[PDB]
Write a protein that binds this ligand. Structure first.
Ligand SMILES: *Cc1c(COP(=O)(O)O)cnc(C)c1O
Ligand SMILES: *Cc1c(COP(=O)(O)O)cnc(C)c1O
Ligand SMILES: C[C@H](N)C(=O)CCCCCC(=O)O
Ligand SMILES: C[C@H](N)C(=O)CCCCCC(=O)O
Lengths: 448, 448
């Protein structure tokens, strides 16, 4: 009836980033969403406290967004961008160029964030080959960094739950140290920033001639536990990259489009990427579209007569999908007409105090926040900062507790993520912090 | 204004698989489509003779497909498949399992064909270490194989012009030869087949204890020039993969969903893949949805208590998108109520005769076809079968002539690809083949 839908799900599906024995024990099937809440096939409603995995902006069944896709259906759903283009993709490219960092003048589409990162890495590799510098073939990427699941993006990721096993498949990369101030040693953001930059510079001084690009998440590392970079760090990596002739790839797939209370997160420190990835909330969270921005200097390294062999030979079949681009176009009009970014910045002030209060809980160790990008790191001892053994599944148990309490999210290890939709109201925010607090306590007061 | 949308496209876009200097010289912006024709912003109409790069099934503005997406907007556009599922992804999963090879019982969603292949390759690699055979970690891919553009897909793909700037970023891979009947000495499909299988068997015999999987396009190598595998070749590959304990990965991204006159091309030789990649036409050409099918034996090697770390740690954020899944569900209902596959198979009989007439031209060296998947290889000499030098751009020029004559396709080197929508009538196919024949004559008669 809907009983059968549940059994079908367990019989035919294989779900991303999930142990299916876990799914089969606690299955959940979503049927509709309205505002910032989704509804399962039984009629239970849940706050979407993780924005459907960090991509949902205006909430669900956002009226203008729905209208924008109906309008485009009435014209054409998809025609190709291989050797040509279409209207919404071209319009969107100009709108994207207008709001991104000033040095990024080019828009290369694809389907997902891993793909946009996969394209940034290939662009950066082929640039140096193109301009007669074929030795520049290694990458630097940051520890605790994550850039997607395909093999290039994996070669540049460093979350060892996900990646360690795939080492034989990975290309040659250096891993640079980032600040993780919470379980640091001095606990000072300036000291941690300066030490990690010092070590970046020494790595660069020794090997830059072999290195095409450096990859880094913009301001906040997400899959690693919503670890926010100390002030001045990102701008410090930009300078080091410029100085040692390494292209800087900035990953904005999670932080992009208002998430950190700027349109793009590298605005906090005014950094200009050479290459920049984006996805998730670009479409409001409706459809798979992704982008790699490039500078003009990069673009023209590939512009030449065709048998001069400059061409970038990459491109997915759905590249520039009109349906995706149309809803992205409306999304960005909503940012403008709603003043979304400003409202996120305002609402994050009070949210700040709401989140700092969780510290009152015995097993909450750290609270991290930049805008609407937050994590509560759970700890078996605040004093110690010693974490619970992984085998007690504390983050997992907390997610399940929140779920029965009517709120959806996913933990990053024992870090409880909180990335509520950008349209979230001040009262919705406090209603979600309250459920999260209740859940952490109920689970954690028993150290399950 | 037409002229400034055109100048915006030259200014802010970087297109897929395109030398932007070629684009600038000959810009083309599509506005709408109706049935199997698309229309540019100047109002000029074109036959869609490459199905918008091999993905459009029913034409454009297909009413049923249109209704299906509108109906889904009215419920929800995207909620996550991480740790949970939704209604259309669940229903779609069931239907896909029913129409796919019987041994394939499991569906793992993604956004694109490359991502589906990347998933297949990561499943094969981790499968063997989950069951305690870490030795089995190498891949075999077929000479002239194309599996997508992301780094893992290109590590198992061999299109010299595409891959191998990127040599340094692969991942070593065993390359086996495919029978290329047209420019082979005997040729003779049976002689070719059996010798390429003798070389595979040799490769397996020596290295099979190191090999995780063999990766192969299903029945036709597309990007390499629409090269049809001889009868018995695919069934022999499968047999040798079984004999030597190597998983068979089958790429159906281009051939899948009716293209070759079967629902899946592997049905031609009755082959059961271990892992099967699909995409493109899965949605009728409307949206980016892809699938990796897996057997239950493979699924169950990642199925275990979370602490025994069996889990597949992979999954894009738009996995199981309701919008793509909804349109795909309706796409498949059409295959059923419109008997698309049987209609393609039937129409393909007369079509073969249209294409044999094409063969009458002095510079048409070969015609290749399986269902609606066709290729007309151009040669400067049809008795020596010598190719035009690349530097005289014969494929590119033919595609531009077809353009002005009102038809879109893309060449593969000097092979003119012909992949018309599956809804194409008998009349429309002959209209299309005639425009293609005129354009080959007008370009090629001037080139000696
Ligand atoms: C989401 C994420 C990705 C991967 O994007 P997908 O669409 O899931 O493939 C890449 N980089 C960052 C920083 C991300 O947050
Ligand atoms: C189209 C294709 C791919 C890649 O799919 P995308 O959606 O373009 O990334 C991979 N393998 C084959 C055989 C294909 O035809
Ligand atoms: C567009 C998609 N990446 C695809 O697989 C098509 C095959 C390669 C396309 C090369 C061309 O048509 O110019
Ligand atoms: C969904 C997408 N692959 C993404 O970037 C999130 C990765 C980290 C999420 C880990 C989890 O939620 O379990």
């Amino acid at each position: 009836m809907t009983h059968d839908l549940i059994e079908k799900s367990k019989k035919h599906l294989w779900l991303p980033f999930t142990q299916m024995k876990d799914y089969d024990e606690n299955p959940l099937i979503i049927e509709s969403g309205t505002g910032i809440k989704v509804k399962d096939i039984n009629g239970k409603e849940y706050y979407d406290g993780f924005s459907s995995v960090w991509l949902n902006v205006h909430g669900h069944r956002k009226k203008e967004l729905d209208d924008a896709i109906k309008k485009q259906l009435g014209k054409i759903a998809h025609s190709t961008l291989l050797g040509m283009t279409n209207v919404p993709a071209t319009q969107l490219a100009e709108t994207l160029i207008d709001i991104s960092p000033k040095k990024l003048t080019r828009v290369f589409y694809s389907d997902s964030g891993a793909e946009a990162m996969e394209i940034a890495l290939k662009m950066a590799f082929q640039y140096w080959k193109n301009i007669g510098k074929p030795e520049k073939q290694k990458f630097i990427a940051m520890k605790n960094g994550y850039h997607g699941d395909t093999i290039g993006a994996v070669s540049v990721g460093s979350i060892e739950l996900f990646h360690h096993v795939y080492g034989p498949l990975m290309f040659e990369s250096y891993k640079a140290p980032i600040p993780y101030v919470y379980r640091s040693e001095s606990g000072d953001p300036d000291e941690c920033r300066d030490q990690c930059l010092r070590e970046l510079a020494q790595l660069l001084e020794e090997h830059h001639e072999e290195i095409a690009a450096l990859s880094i998440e913009s301001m906040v590392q997400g899959a690693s536990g919503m670890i926010v970079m100390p002030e001045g760090y990102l701008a410090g990596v930009r300078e080091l990259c410029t100085t040692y002739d390494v292209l800087m790839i900035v990953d904005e797939v999670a932080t992009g489009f208002g998430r950190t209370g700027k349109m793009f997160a590298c605005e906090h420190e005014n950094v200009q990427p050479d290459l920049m990835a984006a996805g998730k909330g670009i479409t409001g969270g409706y459809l798979p579209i992704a982008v790699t921005f490039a500078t003009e200097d990069i673009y023209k390294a590939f512009y030449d007569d065709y048998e001069n062999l400059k061409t970038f030979f990459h491109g997915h079949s759905y590249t520039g999908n009109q349906l995706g681009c149309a809803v992205a176009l409306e999304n960005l009009a909503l940012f403008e007409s709603e003043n979304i970014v400003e409202q996120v910045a305002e609402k994050s002030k009070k949210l700040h105090f709401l989140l700092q209060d969780l510290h009152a809980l015995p097993h909450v160790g750290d609270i991290r926040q930049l805008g609407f990008m937050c994590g509560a790191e759970l700890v078996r001892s605040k004093e110690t900062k010693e974490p619970y053994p992984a085998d007690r599944r504390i983050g997992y148990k907390v997610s399940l507790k929140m779920r029965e309490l009517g709120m959806l999210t996913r933990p990053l290890g024992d870090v409880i993520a909180f990335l509520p939709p950008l349209a979230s109201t001040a009262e919705e925010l406090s209603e979600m912090v309250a459920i999260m607090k209740q859940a952490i306590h109920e689970v954690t007061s028993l150290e399950d």
